[PDB]
Amino acid sequence: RNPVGGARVHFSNPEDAIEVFVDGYAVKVPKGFTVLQACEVAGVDIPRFCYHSRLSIAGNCRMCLVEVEKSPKPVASCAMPALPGMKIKTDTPIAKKAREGVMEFLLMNHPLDCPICDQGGECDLQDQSMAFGSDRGRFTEMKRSVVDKNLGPLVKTVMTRCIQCTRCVRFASEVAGVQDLGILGRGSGEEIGTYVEKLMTSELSGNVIDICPVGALTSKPFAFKARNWELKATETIDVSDAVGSNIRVDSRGPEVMRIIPRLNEDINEEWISDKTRFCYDGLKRQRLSDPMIRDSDGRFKAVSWRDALAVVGDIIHQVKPDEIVGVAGQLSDAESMMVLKDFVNRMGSDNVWCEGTAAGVDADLRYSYLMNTSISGLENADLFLLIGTQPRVEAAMVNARICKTVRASNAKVGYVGPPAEFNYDCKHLGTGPDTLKEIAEGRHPFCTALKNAKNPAIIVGAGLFNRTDKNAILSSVESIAQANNVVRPDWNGLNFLLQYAAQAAALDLGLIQQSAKALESAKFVYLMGADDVNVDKIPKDAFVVYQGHHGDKAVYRANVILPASAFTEKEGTYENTEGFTQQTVPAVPTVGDARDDWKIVRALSEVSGVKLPYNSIEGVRSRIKSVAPNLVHTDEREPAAFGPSLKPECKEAMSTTPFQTVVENFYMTNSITRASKIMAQCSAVLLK
Amino acid sequence: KRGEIGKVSGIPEEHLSRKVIIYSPARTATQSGSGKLGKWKINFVSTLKWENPLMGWTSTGDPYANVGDSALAFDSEEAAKSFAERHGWDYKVKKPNTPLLKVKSYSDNFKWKGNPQPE
Amino acid sequence: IGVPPNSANLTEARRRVFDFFRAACRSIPTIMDIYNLQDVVAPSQLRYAISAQIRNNAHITDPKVIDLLIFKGMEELTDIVDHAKQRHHIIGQYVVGGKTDFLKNFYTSNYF
Amino acid sequence: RSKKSPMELISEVPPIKVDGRIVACEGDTNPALGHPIEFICLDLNEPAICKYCGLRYVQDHH
Amino acid sequence: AWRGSISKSMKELRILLCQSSPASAPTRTFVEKNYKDLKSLNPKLPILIRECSGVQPQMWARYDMGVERCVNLDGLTEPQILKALENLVKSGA
Amino acid sequence: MDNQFIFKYSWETLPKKWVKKMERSEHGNRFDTNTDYLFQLLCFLKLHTYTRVQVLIDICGVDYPSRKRRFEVVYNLLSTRYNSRIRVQTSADEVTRISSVVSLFPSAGWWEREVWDMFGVSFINHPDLRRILTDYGFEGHPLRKDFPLSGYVQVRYDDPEKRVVSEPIEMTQEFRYFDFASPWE
Ligand SMILES: CCCCCCCCCCCC(=O)SCCNC(=O)CCNC(=O)[C@H](O)C(C)(C)COP(=O)(O)O
Ligand code: SF4
Ligand code: SF4
Ligand code: FES
Ligand SMILES: [Zn+2]
């Protein structure tokens, strides 16, 4: 037989493996597993309400009670450790009668509001009541009730339906790191709440909607909109940040209803951030849908695809080859970036780069812009040194795993950068390059812990790449990495954290800026979804073409607007901060007369008298295979090949300006969230 | 692809050149049960839908709008791959993401912090 | 009469293909009279149409698949012989018939 | 009075005075002809709204 | 002295290889013992080293306008790889 | 006469190489045989004195896309003399021809034509195997699991063409599939 849900049991050694009899079947489990986990290995799925595999054990609900031969009373299988030779019994009358008793107690004060509950067709309480519960209720007295409390603009609260499993409290205390929710009171009158009118300000606060087994905690924007049985589930990835969390887009027709997490033990581990969860609102607002060209007076008129392409192809032949600049956006996929690079190269230019970390970064060796330690590999680190990075706002899930490691392995975190708020205890070593200089030479008290740590982990932020002293800072970081051993064959510690979903693919494909002063001396700028660049930098004589799906400040400057499809409407490959390549699956139809980015660039190349060998998405991926062949071997764990020793010696001077913060508004980062209605009211009341 | 069964089946040649995804749907995040797992499905990527300009209903022109979600289900990846191979569909396989059972104990909630260190 | 037993080799499949093709050829005059195809199509354009269908299904090497194809073709021929199908249907199926394909498809719609 | 939407019509019904801290709303005089029983806690200052009927209940004395 | 004019003629040098194979081992040796020298002599040339599992050892070179030339480094030694790079640098542009 | 007696008698009397699976239950005594022994088994079960099965109730196909032999053909049989029912099943894929039983049971012709129409299974020695239910010129076998519920083509009247024509299907409101499956099943 196979474990429930295809769960993989990792046996550290064959010696430490006890044997249990779940239902007369011999089961081998490691020492430390509980009765519930042993049953899960044996294909038996025990009912549960308060137990979560990512939260600490708390045997409240008493729903997982089973029978054990050497036990006078039923044991809570979620908390009872498995012993060698133990005989578990799950389908016996004792465990049954216990399950109906517990269900009868749970459904005693529960409100009769299944029809209006947003957990209607997806509730564990009623699903288990049908299966493991009884048929008739013996309760006739008056039920209890509680008032509802405001937890913010994201979590809708109806605590009359609370079953008091305390999963939200445990999540807030352990995973989120923001202790603001707790069980208040004693007895049947105990309630979940924050006591003082306050709102859930955690970037992971939206995950309490999922961990709640009942409709007590539900999404406020996705309130009453639809039922779960009406929604088609698409397994897609994230593009808001460079973590690339695995999500599940649910849609009802041509619009996206909601986004919920998807299991991935190596990237997100069942959680997503609020920005990921509530970015679907912007996909249906201010969407560009028709090609548009400015008029003589200065107004945009809707134009067919043929005429817009004709205009841009006619203007592209009137500018000098080095006058052409193509800038890719943060949401761009690898194929379209490759097509854009080919198009600009054939025209005689070499100025192609991405929105963010594209100031001249050397992408020559691929360990200098990737998390050489996997995200899941950060759990083995003993000391984190965050050099000018704020993972809480940049890569919120990497912050989640850092908090997990700190609260479990008692790791130490040393932070070097601008003042910020952390959900774990951190030591503020400094605020600028002088701190790195102090660390490198030694005698700093944190250097003792750095050199006395078995598995240190240095994490450098992507914002450290736009500075003028980038080479000096990278050299000093590598000197720290070499002197205090962090890069070894058995453990790699040097990490670089990117902020944009397209940065890893752009650096892999060679999309690196050549001339720093290239956007001021340009005459044809092709803003391929790049609305996060300063449009005031572009000269007033330049012909700016904006290719995107949302209207932003770049639209007010563009001369031609070419509508494009969002990440939920196309097949594209994105690379994580760790170099892991994933693909998005289309979920909803493209709105209006908008086309895929690579299609638009290919059509423009054809109209501009430039032939491109590929004509389909399969042809482009063959071209990528000759540039970055790891962007087509999707879902493969390929580690870095070389180390920091190959970089040439660079004796520059490190500057004195303190590090800046790259994300000011966590809820306003890309164009989709910038056009969303939920993110506006989130940044209006949740940000301080 | 030896799509001979596709030729002797009756599917029109236009729909025999579709690109499909073979995958195993994962457990929903809002429920802890693991009953709807282990089955493999063929995703036809049928996204071409619009809105009826009389009542707002969702219109479609794709015959494979819900076949893979409603009727076409397989018990293994090999079965779905063989089906796609015989029907001549260009397929790609997405391996499912499975949980890893780690050691968790109730006593870990109550762990000694250590001797008070005046560091 | 009865459906023939399944073939055992490719030679039998080829023989049945030739027999079915000859049967369709003998069926040509009857269609010219049941439907007013006299001043419509030459008596050899249809023959070329069946030849082209056989030739573009000629990459099959499985005798069972060939037998099923022959059976379906014979069923279609029997249906056409009867007045079951409408007149324009056979004329809609049995008639023999600049920048870039990609750019025209791009101008048409996003879904290729 | 078709110009009044149901929201405005239910916003004009004065709240029902209840002496206790909790009231059970069924939606009609005959229980079988109303909505499922709903117990509403009157421990706030604003009137408490039934999630089925829209009727508002306010505590009488304290 | 051809190692000092690589950036003058070329515009990008990609060296595809595999990190776990016995066919790309001379390519790995060439990268290890020559990347620092070439990069030091040509600070602005983007010498990209990209590796995957099922990849044959190659060596690409973009030129003035999209022109690319590739050499299969599958049966060459390290001096042979260096000579192939010399041919790309010299005869290419 | 009964499931307990028919099971034992057919276990003893029947040749062993014919049947390869025998279920004895209250839902029905089934026999599973190879497609090359179906006709022999039914001829035996139609003529034997203690198993006088003289009524063929119906022939139905079942589609199992996950199996190598995709289609399951079920023969529901009735014995009026002994007041008993017997079910015989075989398995065939899309490109094998199974033997026809019209020789033994004359009524089998229409159910065999319906099975061929609905699933695409061909029968050897069938006097006339042509579609019986679907429209003239129908392409595809609707009762297969991979066949879309609404089909591929649609029918409407074309005024310029002055005849009823067939066009690719285009629904004004698509079929909404509701997933009611529970994870605690
Ligand atoms: C109005 C009339 C109505 C009916 C018209 C007919 C409609 C259906 C047409 C039949 C459709 C089919 O695929 S039925 C026929 C399909 N069967 C085959 O194609 C066999 C494989 N072909 C070969 O073996 C050789 O290429 C061969 C071509 C034999 C010769 O070449 P040689 O001998 O050198 O080997
Ligand atoms: S939480 Fe579940 S059982 Fe309670 S009202 Fe909502 S759907 Fe019904
Ligand atoms: S609000 Fe939900 S998660 Fe929190 S204790 Fe109540 S039922 Fe559990
Ligand atoms: S799941 Fe074990 S007592 Fe609640
Ligand atoms: Zn009410």
Residue C10's domain comprises 1-112
Facing C106 at nearest CB: one of A565, A590, A603 = A603
Q: Are A5 and B37 in contact (CB under 8 A)?
A: yes
Q: Which 3 state secondary structure label does DSSP give D31?
A: helix
From C93, C75, C90, C74, select the one nearest C20 (Cα to Cα): C74
Q: How far is CA E54 from CA A533, A572, A625, E30, E60, in A?
A: 37, 21, 11, 19, 17
Facing A264 at nearest CB: one of B23, B35, B97 = B97
Q: How far is A127 from chain D (nearest CA, A)?
A: 20
- What is the sign of the dihedral through the CA atoms of A548, A551, A556 and A560? positive
> Which long-range contacts does A222-230 make (Cβ < 8 Å, 24+ apart)?
A222/A118, A222/A257, A222/A258, A223/A118, A223/A156, A224/A118, A225/A257, A225/A258, A226/A252, A226/A257, A227/A120, A227/A121, A228/A120, A228/A121, A228/A122, A228/B28, A228/B30, A228/F179, A229/A121, A229/F178, A229/F179, A229/F180, A230/F176, A230/F178
Q: Which 3 state secondary structure label does DSSP give D39?
A: strand
Sequence-distant (6+) residues with CB within 8 A of A253 are: A588, B49, B51, B58
CA–centroid distance, residue D46 to ligand 5 (Å):
17
Read off φ and ψ for residue C12, nearest 5 degrees. Answer: -65, -40
The verdict on the CB of residue A120 being under 6 Å from ligand 2 is yes
- β-strand pairing of A256-261 with A246-251: antiparallel
At E2, list the tokens: 């051809």
From A141, A193, A116, select the one nearest D50 (Cα to Cα): A116
Identify the chains in contact with D, defined as 3+ C-beta pairs within 8 A: A
Interface residue B10 vs chain F (CB under 8 A) = yes
Rounded distance, CA F114 to CA F63, Å? Answer: 14
Q: Is A141 exposed, middle or buried (0-12, 13-18, 19+ CB in 10 A)?
A: exposed
Q: How far is CA B34 from CA A88, B37, B111, in A?
A: 21, 6, 32
SS3 of A388-431: the string is CCCCCCCCHHHHHHHHHHHHHHCCEEEEECCCCCCCCCCEEEEC
Rounded distance, CA A294 to CA E35, Å? Answer: 49
Q: What is the DSSP letter of A14?
A: S
Q: What is the largest CA-CA distance in chain C?
A: 54
Q: Is D28 exposed, middle or buried (0-12, 13-18, 19+ CB in 10 A)?
A: exposed
CB neighbourhood size of E1 (10 A):
5
- β-strand pairing of A524-528 with A324-328: parallel
CB neighbourhood size of A472 (10 A):
19
Interface residue C107 vs chain A (CB under 8 A) = yes
Tokens 């400094």 sit on residue: A430
Q: Which 3 state secondary structure label does DSSP give E89?
A: helix
From A100, A107, A56, A104, select the one nearest A78 (Cα to Cα): A56
Distance of CA B12 to the CA centre of its chain: 25
Q: How far is CA F8 from CA A89, C112, F54, F81, F86, in A?
A: 38, 62, 20, 18, 13
Q: Which H/E stretch holds residue B21?
A: strand B19-23
Facing A630 at nearest CB: one of E31, E46, E52 = E52
A118: chain D residues, CB-CB within 8 Å: none
Q: Are E51 and E63 in contact (CB under 8 A)?
A: no
Rounded distance, CA A290 to CA A292, Å? Answer: 6
CA–centroid distance, residue D35 to ligand 5 (Å):
7
Verify whether the Cβ–Cβ distance F180 to A124 is below 8 Å.
no
Q: What is the DSSP string of A327-366?
A: EE-TT--HHHHHHHHHHHHHTT--EEEESSS-SS---SSS
> Domain map of chain B by residue range?
13-117
Q: How far is C67 from chain F (nearest CA, A)?
A: 9
Q: What is the DSSP letter of A264?
A: -
CA–centroid distance, residue A268 to ligand 2 (Å):
28
Interface residue A469 vs chain B (CB under 8 A) = no
Facing A646 at nearest CB: one of E36, E48, E52 = E36
- Helix A617-624 with A334-346: angle, nearest 10 deg: 80
Q: What is the largest CA-CA distance in chain F?
A: 70
A132: chain F residues, CB-CB within 8 Å: 184
SS3 of A55-77: the string is CCCCCCCCCCEEEECCCCCCEEC
Interface residue E65 vs chain A (CB under 8 A) = yes
Q: Please, what is the end-to-end C-alpha distance for chain C in angstroms?
A: 46
Tokens 């649910």 sit on residue: A250
- What is the sign of the dihedral through the CA atoms of F157, F158, F164 and F170? negative
Angle ∠(A203,A206,A212) on CA atoms, nearest 5: 140
Angle ∠(A497,A465,E41) on CA atoms, nearest 5: 115
Q: How far is CA B49 from CA A324, A596, C111, in A?
A: 38, 17, 11
Dihedral angle over CA of F11, F13, F16, F19, nearest 10: -60
The answer to whether A123 is annotated as binding is: yes
F152: chain B residues, CB-CB within 8 Å: 11-12, 15, 63
Verify whether the Cβ–Cβ distance A131 to F178 is below 8 Å.
no
For residue A565, the chain C residue with the least C-alpha distance is C110
Beta bridge partners of F33: F19
Question: Which of A161, A165, A212, A224 should be mutated for ligand 2, with most atoms under 8 A from CB?
Answer: A161
The answer to whether A162 is annotated as binding is: yes
Rounded distance, CA A611 to CA A28, Å? Answer: 62
At D9, list the tokens: 């019509």
The number of folded domains in chain C is 1
CA–centroid distance, residue A44 to ligand 1 (Å):
56
- What is the sign of the dihedral through the CA atoms of A539, A540, A544 and A548? positive
A592: chain C residues, CB-CB within 8 Å: none
Verify whether the Cβ–Cβ distance F145 to B31 is below 8 Å.
no
Cβ contacts below 8 Å, chain A against chain C, sum to 27
Interface residue E45 vs chain A (CB under 8 A) = no
CA–centroid distance, residue A335 to ligand 3 (Å):
44
D38: chain A residues, CB-CB within 8 Å: 111-113
The answer to whether A110 is annotated as binding is: yes
Q: Are A77 and A39 in contact (CB under 8 A)?
A: yes
Rounded distance, CA A46 to CA A95, Å? Answer: 10
Q: How far is CA A504 from CA A475, A488, B18, C2, C15, in A?
A: 21, 24, 31, 66, 61
CB neighbourhood size of E54 (10 A):
10
From C92, A234, B67, select the one nearest F169 (Cα to Cα): B67
Angle ∠(C64,C67,C69) on CA atoms, nearest 5: 110
Distance of CA F7 to the CA centre of its chain: 23
Q: Are A36 and A61 in contact (CB under 8 A)?
A: no
- β-strand pairing of B19-23 with B90-94: parallel
Sequence-distant (6+) residues with CB within 8 A of B101 are: A3, A7, A8, A9, A10, A33, A37, A40, A41, A53
> Ligand 3 — pocket residues by CB below 6 A?
A 162-168, 192, 211-212, 214, 216-217
Rounded distance, CA A654 to CA A644, Å? Answer: 19
Interface residue F12 vs chain B (CB under 8 A) = no
Phi-psi region of A360 (alpha: psi -120 to 50; beta: other; left: phi over 0): left
Rounded distance, CA F73 to CA F41, Å? Answer: 14
At A517, list the tokens: 């002063």
Facing A145 at nearest CB: one of D36, D39, D52 = D39
Rounded distance, CA F175 to CA F167, Å? Answer: 19
Rounded distance, CA F105 to CA A619, Å? Answer: 59
Q: Please, what is the end-to-end C-alpha distance for chain F in angstroms?
A: 39
Q: How far is CA B91 from CA A295, A588, A632, B8, B84, in A?
A: 47, 20, 15, 20, 7
CA–centroid distance, residue D26 to ligand 5 (Å):
5
Strands (E), chain E: 12-18, 47-52, 58-62, 71-72
- What is the sign of the dihedral through the CA atoms of F46, F51, F54 and F59? negative
Tokens 């720290």 sit on residue: A480
Rounded distance, CA E57 to CA A111, Å? Answer: 67
Rounded distance, CA A396 to CA A389, Å? Answer: 12
Identify the chains in contact with C, defined as 3+ C-beta pairs within 8 A: A, B, F
Q: What is the DSSP string of A442-494?
A: ---HHHHHHHT-SSEEEEEEGGGGSSTTHHHHHHHHHHHHHHTT-EETTEE-E
Distance of CA D31 to the CA centre of its chain: 15
Rounded distance, CA A632 to CA A629, Å? Answer: 6
For residue A6, the chain B residue with the least C-alpha distance is B98
Q: How many helices (H) and strands (E) does chain C have?
A: 6, 0
Q: What is the DSSP letter of A176?
A: I
Angle ∠(E23,E29,E31) on CA atoms, nearest 5: 105
SS3 of chain F: the string is CCHHHHHHHHHHHCCCCCEEEEECCCCCCEEEECCCCHHHHHHHHHHCHHHCCCEEEEEEEEECCCCCCCEEEEEEEEECCCCEEEEEEEEECCCCEEECCCCCCCCHHHHHHHHHHHHCCEEECCCCCCCCCCCCCCCCCCCCCCCCCCCCEEEEEECCCCEEEEEECCECCCCCCCCCCCCCC
SS3 of B65-77: the string is CCHHHHCCEECCH
Rounded distance, CA A502 to CA A518, Å? Answer: 21
Q: Are F50 and F98 in contact (CB under 8 A)?
A: no
The letter for the amino acid at A22 is V
Q: Which 3 state secondary structure label does DSSP give A619?
A: helix
